[PDB]
Nucleic acid binder design. Structure first.
Ligand SMILES: [Mg+2]
Ligand SMILES: [Mg+2]
Ligand SMILES: [Mg+2]
Ligand SMILES: [Mg+2]
Ligand SMILES: [Mg+2]
Ligand SMILES: [Mg+2]
Ligand SMILES: [Mg+2]
Ligand SMILES: [Mg+2]
Ligand SMILES: [Mg+2]
Ligand SMILES: [Mg+2]
Ligand SMILES: [Mg+2]
Ligand SMILES: [Mg+2]
Ligand SMILES: [Mg+2]
Ligand SMILES: [Mg+2]
Ligand SMILES: [Mg+2]
Lengths: 210, 202, 147, 51, 102
RNA sequence: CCCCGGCGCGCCGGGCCCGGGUCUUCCCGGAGUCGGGUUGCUUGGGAAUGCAGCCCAAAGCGGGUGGUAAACUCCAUCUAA
RNA sequence: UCAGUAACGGCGAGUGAACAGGGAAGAGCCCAGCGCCGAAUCCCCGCCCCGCGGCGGGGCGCGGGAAAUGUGGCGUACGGA
């Protein structure tokens, strides 16, 4: 029975919920399991980055988030072809590669190319044969000063270009923003019916001739 | 060549293929319900479904009676609320092809089911052919392209609904149509949606 | 703390705080929100008016991020930039106007409620309101749009 | 008794820090230490620091 | 004029320089080859036509086109598939005419 | 002090005779399946989310999806069986 | 987290997801088909030497089979030859 004044609250407890109860008493006993296997992994991959292969720079969909930048899954084969890295050898120097990604823009394609250059320049390569160096391989002076990098590799940080204070012109003060918004919204909500009404104005006013 | 038998087996409404499918269906209707075939009836569809013409690969032909699943209850009398008074027009949730693959995977329990296909039907029967693999031959043990099937994880793929015809019945997949099977399966989705996560600190 | 609760003073009294005439039975009104239209109508009308019925159009596949638009008012518009930008524009004499980028702070629309300090600004934002733009002209300033 | 009883409590960080600063500001008072029971009648100075 | 990018309107959106690439090889699928066409017609000439395309052809001979399209739509399903099946069922008919014409 | 294993380095007998870049000529796909009707169950999925039975039954610049049924025309998106 | 939300529902009781985003983890691939290659491939038995307690390595057999109703190598939608 409801009291005087309160909420109409619907509790979702009409199923046998006591059987399927999930308690988190092993959360501290699994955080240590994850950390232990994360340092067994950071010891299995000795000089390779501890976070893993480098990820590209990636905008987000969904206008809620389409101004932040993120770390994608891999570098599209287009960006690998521009950077000059075979798609089957990229995965062996810790470069991430997913083929599913497209590249519609260019401002991001060149950003990820510059990213591959900034990684293939920071890359210290060890020679396949230890007792014998090779051609494309960092020299032993690097290899002795080559450490294991912690955290993400080349971390991605949202930056904003600092624009200094200008002086406002009378063309900036002439710009009616709210009117321009309501006008573009009208000219877009009405574009189809306007074009059809003018196709009718041009399909009727021709009959008068023939 | 194989694409000629392929584009031919799509004109099932033609004359030649309605003569062949009908003499096949008549001959099948006279043999046993589950009998071993000497060789794959459709060699092209068999390759497409994974049949290498080498030792160890077996083809069983099996027929199943068409129609829905009458409810196994007394005369009428399904004691319950009028919602569940249905007996006649009910349907089974597993395809007749999965029932063929599991009557083969049960009649011959040593062999591992790979896939199956349709070779004929009539008003009272549907005829399938199941591609069974012998997982202890050496043509399959040593060949590393197919030694996955010999591990104990793939026991009774069709009793666990992992063949193609079975997977087609569990409504799994990626998309906005397959939301009720996010996670392992329908019951592993149901469990996580109907499971109350009670953290330590709430 | 049970030692603070009310069932520690209720030991020894027969009805345990619940009545001699009318007992504490299990569900003497039905379970949950039962009788919203029959015997709990005075309560569902005195306290939850409009709880019964339909209104408006449905929208099947609603996605809550197409309609994302967090707003910021003019009163706390000058709080998005540092203090040495508003006072630097005070001490400024070459008429330069600081550029306040709002979508960089996390708002799309600018509503104009508060007063403004008398100095020019260049407000970059996605959507503007009529009054929010008039309060900016009336102080001298530009309403830049950014798609 | 069930096992989903609320066993653990969470406290605001600024309040755990208020409590730490209040438990340190109270360890430099001869009365608040001689009243907890400690026998410090001959300690040369309360904030006892050593090399 | 002072035109700005706008979140709304007829050309809304942040402005990027749209690059071009070779279209994915996936989209290529479905297109006929000069060999798969030869197999399709070389089996059309072996099998023939369906018992309902033998009827659609006789309905397109007397030029009862609306009924001959409602028949195909009822018999095969979607209107797009019916229209696309009728177009070829009339191209083959003009072939069986430009054949025995001489 | 015993045993197991890994990570290691030599040696033998084997393998394997191998890559990328630019042009040129070529080739490229999974059917009683998709799909439509209808029936039953299921789903938040509402002019059918999914599945299944029965009937019809494909195409290949095609096919599916783009959360309201239908026709027209554009585009996005993958490439099922 | 979205979310007790969109939606379902004698639109009553009640039921009720997904997208995006932040995290743990992080890895891809393989066929049929289409072609190219003297079937270039596989299993089994007999004998030699070793290895031998997870039944293998190498050599011989005008030894037997499977397989042209298609074995092996290249190759699979990110194109490939
Ligand atoms: Mg009361
Ligand atoms: Mg699997
Ligand atoms: Mg299907
Ligand atoms: Mg009393
Ligand atoms: Mg009593
Ligand atoms: Mg009381
Ligand atoms: Mg009472
Ligand atoms: Mg009570
Ligand atoms: Mg009444
Ligand atoms: Mg049921
Ligand atoms: Mg239900
Ligand atoms: Mg997401
Ligand atoms: Mg992580
Ligand atoms: Mg292969
Ligand atoms: Mg082959």
């Amino acid at each position: 029975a409801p009291s005087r004044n309160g909420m109409i609250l619907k509790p979702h407890f009409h199923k046998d919920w006591q059987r399927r109860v999930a308690t988190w008493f092993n959360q501290p006993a699994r955080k240590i399991r994850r950390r232990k296997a994360r340092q067994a992994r950071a010891r299995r991959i000795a000089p390779r980055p501890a976070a893993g292969p480098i990820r590209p720079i990636v905008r987000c969909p969904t206008v809620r988030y389409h101004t932040k930048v993120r770390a994608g899954r891999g570098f599209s084969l287009e960006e690998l072809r521009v950077a000059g890295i075979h798609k089957k050898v990229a995965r062996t120097i810790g470069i991430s590669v997913d083929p599913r990604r497209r590249n519609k823009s260019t401002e991001s394609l060149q950003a990820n190319v510059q990213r591959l250059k900034e990684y293939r320049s920071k890359l210290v390569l060890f020679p396949r044969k230890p007792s014998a160096p090779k051609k494309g391989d960092s020299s032993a002076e690097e290899l002795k000063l080559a450490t294991q990098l912690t955290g993400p590799v080349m971390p991605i940080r949202n930056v904003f270009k600092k624009e200094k204070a200008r002086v406002i012109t009378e063309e900036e003060k002439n710009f009616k923003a709210f009117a321009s918004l309501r006008m573009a919204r009208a000219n877009a909500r009405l574009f189809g019916i306007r074009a059809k009404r003018a196709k009718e104005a041009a399909e009727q006013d021709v009959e008068k001739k023939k | 060549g194989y694409k000629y038998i392929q584009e031919l087996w799509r004109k099932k409404q033609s004359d030649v293929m309605r003569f062949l499918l009908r003499v096949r269906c008549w001959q099948y209707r006279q043999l046993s319900a589950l009998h071993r075939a000497p060789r794959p009836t459709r060699p092209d569809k068999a390759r497409r479904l994974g049949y290498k013409a080498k030792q160890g690969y077996v083809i069983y032909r099996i027929r199943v009676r068409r129609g829905g699943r009458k409810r196994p209850v007394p005369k009428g009398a399904t004691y319950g609320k009028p919602v569940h008074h249905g007996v006649n027009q009910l349907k089974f949730a597993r395809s007749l092809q999965s029932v063929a693959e599991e009557r083969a995977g049960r009649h011959c329990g040593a062999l591992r089911v790979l896939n199956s296909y349709w070779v004929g039907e009539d008003s009272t029967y549907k005829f399938f052919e199941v591609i069974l693999i012998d997982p202890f031959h050496k043509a399959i043990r040593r060949n590393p392209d197919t030694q996955w099937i010999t591990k104990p994880v793939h026991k009774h793929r069709e009793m666990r609904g992992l063949t193609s015809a079975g997977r087609k019945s569990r409504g799994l997949g990626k998309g906005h149509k397959f939301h009720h099977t996010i996670g392992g399966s329908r019951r592993a989705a149901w469990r996580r949606r109907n499971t109350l996560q009670l953290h330590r600190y709430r | 703390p049970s030692r603070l609760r009310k069932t520690r003073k209720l030991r020894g009294h027969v009805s345990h705080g619940h009545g001699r005439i009318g007992k504490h039975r299990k569900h003497p009104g039905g379970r949950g929100n039962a009788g919203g239209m029959h015997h709990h109508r005075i309560n569902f009308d005195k306290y939850h008016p409009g709880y019964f019925g339909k209104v408006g159009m449905r929208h099947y596949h609603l996605k809550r991020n197409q309609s994302f638009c967090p707003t910021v008012n003019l009163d706390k518009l000058w709080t998005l930039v540092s203090e040495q930008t508003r006072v630097n524009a005070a001490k400024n004499k070459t008429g330069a106007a600081p550029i306040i980028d709002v979508v960089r702070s996390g708002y799309y629309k600018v509503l104009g409620k508060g007063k403004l300090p008398k100095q020019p600004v260049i407000v970059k934002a996605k959507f503007f309101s009529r009054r929010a733009e008039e309060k900016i002209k009336g102080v001298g300033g530009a309403c830049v749009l950014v798609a | 008794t069930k096992t989903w009883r609320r066993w653990h409590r969470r406290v605001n960080t600024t309040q755990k820090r208020y409590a730490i600063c209040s438990a340190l500001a109270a360890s430099a008072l001869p009365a608040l230490v001689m009243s907890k029971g400690h026998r410090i009648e001959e300690v040369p100075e309360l904030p006892l620091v050593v090399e | 004029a002072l035109r700005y990018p706008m979140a709304v309107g007829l050309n809304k959106g942040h402005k990027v320089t749209k690059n071009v690439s070779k279209p994915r090889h996936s989209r290529r699928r479905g297109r006929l080859t000069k060999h798969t066409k030869f197999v399709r017609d070389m089996i059309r000439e072996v099998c023939g036509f369906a018992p309902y395309e033998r009827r659609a052809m006789e309905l397109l001979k007397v030029s009862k086109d609306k009924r001959a399209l409602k028949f195909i739509k009822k018999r095969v399903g979607t209107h797009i598939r019916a229209k696309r099946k009728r177009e070829e069922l009339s191209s083959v008919l003009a072939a069986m005419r430009k054949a025995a014409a001489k």
